[PDB]
Design a protein around this ligand. Structure first.
Ligand SMILES: [Mg+2]
Lengths: 140, 73
């Protein structure tokens, strides 16, 4: 309900690197005072959360246009089992920056060869049980 | 699909490379052919000059012969 996100995706086989372009976003819900939020998008490889990339902060727009580009130096063999994460954040100067949305893209569903560029609907980020342990016994 | 795609890209890279090598060879042959062509042009040029001098000599000689025949008639 927050809005949609237009992004670009393609792989450069000449340098063996992933080219992820953040085009823009639309119809984002307002969380700030003026009637518009201060959005910025954090993008990182889904498999390992290392070297996350963040865009510049746009002031008071529910339709921010970033038109930025990020490069992930990752071989083509490892790429197949690697996912992409694009999460939209709301900037606040005096508090925690609340997450507006998030989107995950499996690299096995992605088809490289033609330059990909699409709009995808944003969804609410997941907050499961922490322990994840189990005990087995018998009763008689 | 993906493996075949990467291999396809590298393939096109190699093909373009060896193609450029072929180009280098071709422009080398062209280069040399051009050089020897110019050489031939110089040689044949000097030959044409000698031909011209020949024609001039013929003209003067026949002018004299004309004079003698007019002096005889
Ligand atoms: Mg704010």
């Amino acid at each position: 309900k927050l809005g949609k996100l237009q992004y670009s995706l393609d792989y450069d086989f000449q340098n063996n690197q992933l080219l992820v372009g953040i085009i823009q976003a639309a119809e984002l819900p307002a969380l700030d005072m003026g009637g518009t939020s201060d959005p910025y998008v954090k993008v990182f490889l889904l498999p390992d959360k290392k070297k996350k990339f963040e865009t510049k902060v746009h002031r008071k727009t529910l339709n921010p246009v970033f038109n930025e580009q990020f490069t992930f130096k990752v071989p083509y063999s490892e790429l197949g089992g690697k996912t992409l994460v694009m999460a939209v954040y709301d900037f606040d100067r005096f508090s925690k920056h609340d997450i507006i949305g998030e989107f995950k893209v499996p690299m096995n569903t992605v088809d490289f060869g033609h330059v990909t560029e699409e709009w995808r609907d944003l969804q609410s980020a997941e907050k499961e049980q922490e322990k994840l342990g189990d005990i087995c016994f018998s009763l008689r | 699909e993906l493996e075949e795609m990467q291999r396809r890209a590298d393939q096109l890279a190699d093909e373009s490379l060896e193609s450029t090598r072929r180009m280098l060879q071709l422009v080398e042959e062209s280069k040399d052919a051009g050089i020897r062509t110019l050489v031939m042009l110089d040689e044949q040029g000097e030959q044409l000059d000698r031909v011209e001098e020949g024609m001039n000599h013929i003209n003067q000689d026949m002018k004299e012969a004309e004079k003698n025949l007019k002096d005889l008639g």
